Each structure stands twice: as structure tokens, then as C-alpha cells.
């Protein structure tokens, strides 16, 4: 089997991408944030505290003839930005782009933190990291990809995120028309539960490539590119007037600036992020200070190749017995 679904930016900045997912019988379609940096599929639901729902589409398990409470199971997750959610668990049929998994754990939120409530465009998350990170207790549950893998033509999924435009998540096949040149594959460590890999270095604009190992995770659920302070300082030093603002929480730059591109290495290959991809617009409405798309990871503990980086590539998440990542230009 295969599946193919369009993923669409939630706003004009590409802050996140939502993909329609069919849950239950008859289908209830929710728009989920596919997140290669987590491993829970959780949804706003008829069980979510009413004051914490503000415009989201909800899953109502009592209206699904295939829903079954997973007795005794609970979940609770906290994300890198401090947001969180928790609840109980049903199993149900879940389809993405024509690919169907029966008995998928659908984690129904009883509580969500304010940042989720305040975002009416995201009805939940669909985690695509390794199932060892799944938070369901006392019986950990498998991700949608893990459940689908055996049925897929090939045990892979691909992320093709658009810049200010829709893109595609494919399951079970590699669309050879969707990228240019060749895909370069690179080793993955699953020891922390993530799609963790080592970039071979970087360049700023037309500058020379610096060969240096940068360990980080491929995370579709993170907006920006978080890299070591040395690398980030080298980038912003090429933007007149750019500075790190403690009050804003990162590097800002004059909205009148033209940003240089940023290249990262994948083995001997190079992925070029155009400068425009690094512009996240005014810090507040009407400001002439703009927020940068490349930020320091120093306070995170891990480097993160988020959407800023991934949208410049066609990315293969190869879930073979020894997982690997593939990157191609597009």
C-alpha cells in the first residue's frame, strides 16, 4: 500500500503545516500537524475541557462505530516549547491520503495548554518519530507509520514541505518526480527516539563551506532551524543590523535587509536554504524588526533541522531495520 496527502501552511509565515487525517467510521476529518519530532497521535476531542477548545475540529469517539476505549491507558506530553497536552486513549481506524491503519491509538485530549487552544488551525498532532517516545502508559503505543510499515510497498515516508505553498507527505514510496538530482542518504541514530543525524557542515551565502559535524534532528514539528551559537553568529554577522535580542528571544534583523542563503551539508551533498526562507516577519504587527529563521540551539540541548531547513529539501524518512535519512534538492 501507499498513501499521499497534501500538507498546507497554517499561516503566511509557514509557522506549521496541517494535513487532513480521517479518523473513525464514518470518517471524522481533522487537520493534524505531522511531527517527526514526537511519537503521539493526539487530537482535540469531545473530551477536551470546553474552555480549552476555540475553533478546532474535534474527534467524538462516541460517533465512531470503530472506536474502542483502550482501557486504563493515559497519555501526557510536553513539547520543547513548553506546551503540553494529556488525556485518555481510544483505538480507531485512521487514514492518511488513502493509507488506512486499523487499531491505531488515537490519544484524546482532556487538557491542552494555552498555545494549542489559541491555534484554531491545528486539531492535533500525528507523531512520526520512533515509537519508543510514545507517552501512552502503561502500554506504550505505536505511531501511525510503525503500524502502517509492514503494509507499505517500501518502509518509508517522505516530507516535501512548501515555501509559502502546500507540499506533500507520501507513505510507502519515493516520488522520483518530486526532486532534482539524486537523494543523498545519511546515517540515523535512534538512541534518543528521534531522526537524529549528523550534518557535514555549512556555508553562509556565497561563502566557503565549513566542514564540521553538526548532530541534530529532522523535526517537521519545529518551525525554525536551531544550530550551535557559533554557526548562528556567523550567519547573522552577514546581515547588517542583525542582533540577538534577549527581550525578543533570539536574533532579529531589520525588515529592510536582504538575507543571505544558508547551506547545510548532507554527506558530500549540499542543501541551500534561500535567504527568503529565513525571514519570519515583524516581531509584532507594524514593527520594522523582523524575526530570524535561524536561531541558537544553545538553550535546547540539541540542534534542530526544523521546517526552515526541511522545506528546502525533499526528505526521505527511511524506516528500514536500520533507519536512514535522505535529502535531495527540489
Contact 108, 52 (CB under 8 A): no
Measured in angstroms, the resolution is 1.1
Contact 123, 281 (CB under 8 A): no
Catalytic one of 199, 261, 296, 297 = 199
C-alpha grid cell for residue 98? 488513502
Indicate if 146 belongs to the active site: no
Q: By CB neighbour count within 10 A (0-12 exposed, 13-18 middle, 19+ buried), where does 245 fall? A: middle
- As a whole number of angstroms, the distance between CA 143 and CA 197 comes to 20
Contact 105, 75 (CB under 8 A): no
Strand partners, 326: 185, 316
| Domains of the chain: residue spans and CATH | 5-174 (2.40.70.10), 175-330 (2.40.70.10)
Burial per residue of 277-307, b for 16 or more beta-carbon CB atoms within 10 angstroms, e otherwise: bbbbeebeeeeebbbbbbbbbeeeeebbbbb
- As a whole number of angstroms, the distance between CA 217 and CA 91 comes to 29
- As a whole number of angstroms, the distance between CA 201 and CA 315 comes to 18
- As a whole number of angstroms, the distance between CA 50 and CA 230 comes to 45
Sign of CA dihedral 96, 101, 105, 110: positive
Catalytic one of 35, 119, 160, 219 = 35
Amino acid at each position: 500500500s501507499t498513501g499521499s496527502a497534501t500538507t498546507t501552511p497554517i499561516d503566511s509565515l509557514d509557522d506549521a503545516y496541517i494535513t487532513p487525517v480521517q479518523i473513525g467510521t464514518p470518517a471524522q476529518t481533522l487537520n493534524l500537524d505531522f511531527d517527526t519530532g514526537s511519537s503521539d497521535l493526539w487530537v482535540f476531542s469531545s473530551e477536551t475541557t470546553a474552555s480549552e477548545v476555540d475553533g478546532q475540529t474535534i474527534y467524538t469517539p462516541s460517533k465512531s462505530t470503530t472506536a474502542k476505549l483502550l482501557s486504563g491507558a493515559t497519555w501526557s506530553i510536553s513539547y520543547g516549547d513548553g506546551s503540553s497536552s494529556s488525556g485518555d486513549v481510544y483505538t480507531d481506524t485512521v487514514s492518511v491520503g488513502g493509507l488506512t491503519v486499523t487499531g491505531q491509538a488515537v490519544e484524546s485530549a482532556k487538557k491542552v495548554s494555552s498555545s494549542f487552544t489559541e491555534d484554531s488551525t491545528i486539531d492535533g498532532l500525528l507523531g512520526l518519530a520512533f515509537s519508543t517516545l510514545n507517552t501512552v502508559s502503561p502500554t506504550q503505543q505505536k505511531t501511525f507509520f510503525d503500524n502502517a510499515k509492514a503494509s507499505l510497498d517500501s518502509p518509508v515516508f517522505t516530507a516535501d514541505l512548501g515555501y509559502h505553498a502546500p507540499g506533500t507527505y507520501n507513505f510507502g514510496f519515493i516520488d522520483t518526480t518530486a526532486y532534482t538530482g539524486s537523494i543523498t542518504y545519511t546515517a540515523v541514530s535512534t538512541k534518543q527516539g528521534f531522526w537524529e543525524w549528523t550534518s557535514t557542515g555549512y556555508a553562509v551565502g556565497s561563502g566557503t563551506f565549513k566542514s564540521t559535524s553538526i548532530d541534530g534532528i529532522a523535526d517537521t514539528g519545529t518551525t525554525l532551524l536551531y544550530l550551535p551559537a557559533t554557526v548562528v553568529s556567523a550567519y547573522w554577522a552577514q546581515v547588517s543590523g542583525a542582533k540577538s535580542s534577549s527581550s525578543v528571544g533570539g536574533y532579529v534583523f531589520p525588515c529592510s535587509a536582504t538575507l543571505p542563503s544558508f547551506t547545510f551539508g548532507v554527506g558530500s551533498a549540499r542543501i541551500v536554504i534561500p535567504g527568503d526562507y529565513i525571514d519570519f516577519g515583524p516581531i509584532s504587527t507594524g514593527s520594522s524588526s523582523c524575526f530570524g529563521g535561524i536561531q541558537s540551539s544553545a538553550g535546547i540541548g540539541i540542534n534542530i533541522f526544523g521546517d526552515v531547513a526541511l522545506k528546502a529539501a525533499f526528505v526521505v524518512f527511511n524506516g528500514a531495520t536500520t533507519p536512514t535519512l535522505g535529502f535531495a534538492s527540489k
